[PDB]
Nucleic acid binder design. Structure first.
Ligand SMILES: [K+]
Ligand SMILES: [K+]
Ligand SMILES: [K+]
Ligand SMILES: [K+]
Ligand SMILES: [K+]
Ligand SMILES: [K+]
Ligand SMILES: [K+]
Ligand SMILES: [K+]
Ligand SMILES: [K+]
Ligand SMILES: [K+]
Ligand SMILES: [Mg+2]
Ligand SMILES: [Mg+2]
Ligand SMILES: [Mg+2]
Ligand SMILES: [Mg+2]
Ligand SMILES: [Mg+2]
Ligand SMILES: [Mg+2]
Ligand SMILES: [Mg+2]
Ligand SMILES: [Mg+2]
Ligand SMILES: [Mg+2]
Ligand SMILES: [Mg+2]
Ligand SMILES: [Mg+2]
Ligand SMILES: [Mg+2]
Ligand SMILES: [Mg+2]
Ligand SMILES: [Mg+2]
Ligand SMILES: [Mg+2]
Ligand SMILES: [Mg+2]
Ligand SMILES: [Mg+2]
Ligand SMILES: [Mg+2]
Ligand SMILES: [Mg+2]
Ligand SMILES: [Mg+2]
Ligand SMILES: [Mg+2]
Ligand SMILES: [Mg+2]
Ligand SMILES: [Mg+2]
Ligand SMILES: [Mg+2]
Ligand SMILES: [Mg+2]
Ligand SMILES: [Mg+2]
Ligand SMILES: [Mg+2]
Ligand SMILES: [Mg+2]
Ligand SMILES: [Mg+2]
Ligand SMILES: [Mg+2]
Ligand SMILES: [Mg+2]
Ligand SMILES: [Mg+2]
Ligand SMILES: [Mg+2]
Ligand SMILES: [Mg+2]
Ligand SMILES: [Mg+2]
Ligand SMILES: [Mg+2]
Ligand SMILES: [Mg+2]
Ligand SMILES: [Mg+2]
Ligand SMILES: [Mg+2]
Ligand SMILES: [Mg+2]
Ligand SMILES: [Mg+2]
Ligand SMILES: [Mg+2]
Ligand SMILES: [Mg+2]
Ligand SMILES: [Mg+2]
Ligand SMILES: [Mg+2]
Ligand SMILES: [Mg+2]
Ligand SMILES: [Mg+2]
Ligand SMILES: [Mg+2]
Ligand SMILES: [Mg+2]
Ligand SMILES: [Mg+2]
Ligand SMILES: [Mg+2]
Ligand SMILES: [Mg+2]
Ligand SMILES: [Mg+2]
Ligand SMILES: [Mg+2]
Ligand SMILES: [Mg+2]
Ligand SMILES: [Mg+2]
Ligand SMILES: [Mg+2]
Ligand SMILES: [Mg+2]
Ligand SMILES: [Mg+2]
Ligand SMILES: [Mg+2]
Ligand SMILES: [Mg+2]
Ligand SMILES: [Mg+2]
Ligand SMILES: [Mg+2]
Ligand SMILES: [Mg+2]
Ligand SMILES: [Mg+2]
Ligand SMILES: [Mg+2]
Ligand SMILES: [Mg+2]
Ligand SMILES: [Mg+2]
Ligand SMILES: [Mg+2]
Ligand SMILES: [Mg+2]
Ligand SMILES: [Mg+2]
Ligand SMILES: [Mg+2]
Ligand SMILES: [Mg+2]
Ligand SMILES: [Mg+2]
Ligand SMILES: [Zn+2]
Lengths: 59, 50, 114
RNA sequence: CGACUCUUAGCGGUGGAUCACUCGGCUCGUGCGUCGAUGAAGAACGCAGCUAGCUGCGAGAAUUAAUGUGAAUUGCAGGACACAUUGAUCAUCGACACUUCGAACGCACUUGCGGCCCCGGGUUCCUCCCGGGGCUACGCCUGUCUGAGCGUCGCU
RNA sequence: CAGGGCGAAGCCAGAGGAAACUCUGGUGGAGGUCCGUAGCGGUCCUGACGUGCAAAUCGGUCGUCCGACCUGGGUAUAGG
RNA sequence: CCGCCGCAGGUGCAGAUCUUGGUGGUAGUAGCAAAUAUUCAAACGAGAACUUUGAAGGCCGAAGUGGAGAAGGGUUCCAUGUGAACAGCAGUUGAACAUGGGUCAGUCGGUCCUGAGAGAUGGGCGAGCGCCGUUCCGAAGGGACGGGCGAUGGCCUCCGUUGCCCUCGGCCGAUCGAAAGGGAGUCGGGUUCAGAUCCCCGAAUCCGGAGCGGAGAUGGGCGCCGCGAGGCGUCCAGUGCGGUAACGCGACCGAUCCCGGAGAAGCCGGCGGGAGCCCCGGGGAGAGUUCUCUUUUCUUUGUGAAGGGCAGGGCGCCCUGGAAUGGGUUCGCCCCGAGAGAGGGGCCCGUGCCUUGGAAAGCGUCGCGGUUCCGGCGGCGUCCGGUGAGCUCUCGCUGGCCCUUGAAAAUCCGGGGGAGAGGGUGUAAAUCUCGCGCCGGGCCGUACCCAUAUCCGCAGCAGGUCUCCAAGGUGAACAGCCUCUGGCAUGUUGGAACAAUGUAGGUAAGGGAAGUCGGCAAGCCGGAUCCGUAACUUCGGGAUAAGGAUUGGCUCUAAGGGCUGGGUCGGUCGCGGCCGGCGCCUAGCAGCCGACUUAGAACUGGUGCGGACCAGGGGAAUCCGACUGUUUAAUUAAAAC
RNA sequence: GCAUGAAGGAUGAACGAGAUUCCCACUGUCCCUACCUACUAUCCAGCGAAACCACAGCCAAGGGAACGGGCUUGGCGGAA
RNA sequence: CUGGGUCGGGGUUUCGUACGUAGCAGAGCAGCUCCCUCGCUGCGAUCUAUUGAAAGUCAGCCCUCGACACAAGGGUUUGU
């Protein structure tokens, strides 16, 4: 995800959790050179990322 | 350097985003005189000075 | 020979940038960054040049996760003062109090005279 | 006989003079003569479907409301309940909104580190953790509370 | 901050001596010590270059190279 | 847009090394010459001296033209596309242009701490912005424990909580100040076009917060019942235990307060221990050579953190005992009646080895599949020794040097003390630095260059710019010279020719400084071994003085070490096992193993031999400054300082 | 003693990229110059500046601001 | 029915005797000896013969067409 630079890992985890009604195991964030914050949100093992990507519309 | 403050990194972010050519459709607009971005910075020619 | 490189951004051979060579299960030699050598306590006597025995020689913060036994000797002043100087202070304390009673009673008796 | 060189004319170049133009200056004059802890001036960063600058704006971000207006905006596109008359657009602007730094205000200036109060969650029933809100600068005035003094006194 | 040279004090053994002490061999490893790298510097060719590689550089040759040594970063001193 | 009558002026250019803009001759000229070097074929393509692939010949040569960083740069990184411009020739290439992508952390840093220093407040000064000052002219504490008082009903069960009071508290100075100082704790394998101790897999750990064990702790006395065992009553204990000791065990109460330790430190020498590297003798697997010969040559031949055991190292630690006929002992020292040696033991480190990790993974090799862009599946292997003044790192020990003595603080720990706290024999209690379990670790940086092309010097500039890793041969040696790993294409062009003059290198008959201001430049010398070394002298030097000889190859000779074995008359089973006048000289000997050096000799070569490389010319004086050190960055290195 | 001389005079061993003189050895320093190598220069393909410039560019004498490319009088003068 | 190119050959000349093979040549050393014996084999710089050998030699040396191809062309101009 691309997230607000203000947000931290706790906020990103909490936002993703009940925006998409899933559980999150880990959040890894970086700030890319264009100033945006990119979050790698690893879901719980029971949740499937491909399934969630379909419901979101990513693919 | 790889070591950088958040303020310097955010400053370098704005300078990269600005260093792009004009959209080609800008030229078609009425009363247009901008034929090319005159504020283009090349990393090796002109330095930011920070 | 396979030459090595640092694994951290500190590129200077400082006191904190100390490394030991190690062979990995992957058939390659790498640096491992060593912890600083610990030092056993010097005796509180302040005279004996040697360091105490029975106490682990680790860095100060490591002592916070060691058990009490690993940090002290089962004796009075154990882990803080050497045994030899504890022996001396035991008899020095005893003998001097003995002299004080000797002087006090001697002074008590030194009243018959002028 | 040619080249080459020079001179003069024609045409072609190179260059940007000249002339014409002018939403820009300069000068004079007139009316008004209003910034800020209710956060200014200035700075930073961000904001457009395509947009980098200029401009405009502040996470409600090339604008919201309202009033006036009355069919556009436009470089392309899209929307007949996003192609609108039940109000497009433009103007006005009194309503709402208004990120960070900045006199700049918890401390420090690293998006570094606190403290107090309230709310929600962690089955919270304590500690603790996370999120949110409010507060926490210096000087000074009046008033209040709490006090200090072998300062001056009264009573016992 | 290669590698070598010289070999201070201390120490050991042997020999000589009445003693004072002396002699010999070894050990030892001192010094703003020597030769000489890296480093630092810049002697001479009055060499190259001299509209240069360079608004001071290059080559050979040089000085020093455990010290009054070389060096990064932090910090202090500000125009009579 | 102009004429005429008037009005007004920033009103007339050839120049001012005039100002700004443009343009020539020079001139297709100077130049595209520092650091050895390119060639063949093919591919793609309109197009090839320059791109790519393969082959060859070369170079850097581990003090790199290699592999990674700091500062600085800031997207230059990576992929694809383009070929206008730019990359001083070209270009299908690029650090160019266009489009898209890329930097993932509790344990790598920042963050925290102080350093030199910076700097608020009180105070003082100052017309004033402000300045001085940093404990000084301050009522500079806002915290905690036990207790007492009152409420709270939250989990009214009874502890948290709240206000007050008492008690104690120097905060002896706010705050800032290090991506090299101090500072807990993450490693192995795999993965991308580009990320990685950060992702994935696996194995750990530190810190912070609040269940189950285990410890505390269940002992003894006296009566009664019972064959006994055991139970019952009742009273008394119990903040663990062991070792002569050094100290040990898994915990093993404790506050204000005090003491200490760690953090916490110079430079240099010598020696030893442990790696990694190199070397060697063998065994494998694959590779190279094979005209000939070489059981040959090359390549390859793992086990992370953390835990447990252990080897090894160290100890001014302890017990015994009591030493001169002094002894022990080092390369050097040094140690001893203030306790040597000798015997027994204790502690610390433990980076090494074995084990859990662990072979499942990695790697080598031979095969077999496929979803052919699979962390594919199999087989076999990943072995046994030696050596060392080797080299690098690390750890110790022990010295030397100083009119030089070589941070602080955060932070953590031990001890002294004993105010307290805990329950009355239990289903024990306070309590617990023992084991396991549960939850959490926010924010920022992280791509790449790091340099004869990503930084500074106007540039892809021969300049400048802080570090880590460091192979084989020769050799004294990170010297020079050659090679391997890794890298590169000769430093912004290529072709042809080989005139003068140059720049760089070299040789020269005979002479030998006659050259010249001057031996400037060049040349001579040069290593090592063995000889031999003067004047003078501050007795240390001078000194490699001067001068002389030798030096290759080959075959020998001699010398310089380590480890093991003491076996004793077996009458003889707990022809192996241990007792039996005992053998008990000279292990002074026998076997085995190993490294590198020195000396001597013979033979031998077209007298060559430090064969390249490396590598002092010397002497006699005079002047000056004692010396070493410093200096005019960019004309002076000196006798100047 | 133009004009030496005492915190400086006088002397020094060792040291010196310090100034000077001589000798040995050594040499292309020179007699006396030659030859060789590399890289240029040279020619070519591509690329391609700058300084400078009144106008220009053959002399002798003359006179002239007393040393002329131009003037005078002679010598002469032939593309690129 | 010739020429001048390449290759080859010869001459010349430079250096100094090639590889391999053989040797009761080789300082010595090691093994195998009884088979003879002082034999035989291995290592070994160097020596001797083959071997004035081998190698180079016009690219600006000399003589050769022995061999092999090549040569009757190509382009641009020039008139009293
Ligand atoms: K409207
Ligand atoms: K860097
Ligand atoms: K730090
Ligand atoms: K030092
Ligand atoms: K292992
Ligand atoms: K001379
Ligand atoms: K000096
Ligand atoms: K000098
Ligand atoms: K022969
Ligand atoms: K011969
Ligand atoms: Mg991060
Ligand atoms: Mg630059
Ligand atoms: Mg790194
Ligand atoms: Mg202990
Ligand atoms: Mg024209
Ligand atoms: Mg034009
Ligand atoms: Mg509106
Ligand atoms: Mg900071
Ligand atoms: Mg070395
Ligand atoms: Mg000696
Ligand atoms: Mg010296
Ligand atoms: Mg020296
Ligand atoms: Mg140098
Ligand atoms: Mg010169
Ligand atoms: Mg020149
Ligand atoms: Mg420095
Ligand atoms: Mg320094
Ligand atoms: Mg001034
Ligand atoms: Mg005017
Ligand atoms: Mg004018
Ligand atoms: Mg003009
Ligand atoms: Mg004029
Ligand atoms: Mg030219
Ligand atoms: Mg040239
Ligand atoms: Mg070289
Ligand atoms: Mg080489
Ligand atoms: Mg070298
Ligand atoms: Mg070009
Ligand atoms: Mg690239
Ligand atoms: Mg670009
Ligand atoms: Mg942090
Ligand atoms: Mg101040
Ligand atoms: Mg700080
Ligand atoms: Mg540090
Ligand atoms: Mg990378
Ligand atoms: Mg030193
Ligand atoms: Mg291991
Ligand atoms: Mg281990
Ligand atoms: Mg396996
Ligand atoms: Mg060592
Ligand atoms: Mg106690
Ligand atoms: Mg990186
Ligand atoms: Mg450069
Ligand atoms: Mg450089
Ligand atoms: Mg600049
Ligand atoms: Mg080396
Ligand atoms: Mg070498
Ligand atoms: Mg070259
Ligand atoms: Mg080239
Ligand atoms: Mg270059
Ligand atoms: Mg010659
Ligand atoms: Mg001569
Ligand atoms: Mg001669
Ligand atoms: Mg002579
Ligand atoms: Mg002369
Ligand atoms: Mg002369
Ligand atoms: Mg000279
Ligand atoms: Mg002399
Ligand atoms: Mg010699
Ligand atoms: Mg003189
Ligand atoms: Mg001097
Ligand atoms: Mg010196
Ligand atoms: Mg100078
Ligand atoms: Mg000098
Ligand atoms: Mg100079
Ligand atoms: Mg002086
Ligand atoms: Mg006088
Ligand atoms: Mg005088
Ligand atoms: Mg004197
Ligand atoms: Mg004339
Ligand atoms: Mg004259
Ligand atoms: Mg003239
Ligand atoms: Mg006239
Ligand atoms: Mg014939
Ligand atoms: Zn003591």
């Amino acid at each position: 995800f691309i997230v607000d630079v203000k947000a931290n890992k706790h906020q990103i985890k909490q936002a993703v959790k009940k925006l998409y009604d899933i559980d999150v195991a880990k959040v890894n964030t970086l700030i890319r050179p264009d100033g945006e914050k990119k979050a790698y949100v690893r879901l719980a093992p029971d949740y499937d990322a491909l399934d969630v990507a379909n419901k979101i519309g990513i693919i | 350097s790889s070591h950088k403050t958040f303020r310097i990194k955010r400053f370098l972010a704005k300078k990269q985003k600005q260093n792009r050519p004009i959209p080609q459709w800008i030229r078609m607009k009425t009363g247009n005189k901008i034929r090319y971005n005159s504020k283009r910075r090349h990393w090796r020619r002109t330095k930011l000075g920070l | 020979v396979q030459r090595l490189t640092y694994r951290r951004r500190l590129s200077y051979n400082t006191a904190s940038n100390k490394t030991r060579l190690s062979r990995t299960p992957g058939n390659r030699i790498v640096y491992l960054y060593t912890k600083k050598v610990g030092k056993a306590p010097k005796s509180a006597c302040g005279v004996c040049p040697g360091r105490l025995r029975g106490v682990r020689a680790v860095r100060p913060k490591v002592l916070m996760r060691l058990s009490k036994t690993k940090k002290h000797v089962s004796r009075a002043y154990g882990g803080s003062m050497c045994a030899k100087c504890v022996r001396d202070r035991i008899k020095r304390a005893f003998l001097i109090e003995e002299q004080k009673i000797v002087v006090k009673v001697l002074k008590a008796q030194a009243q018959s005279q002028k």
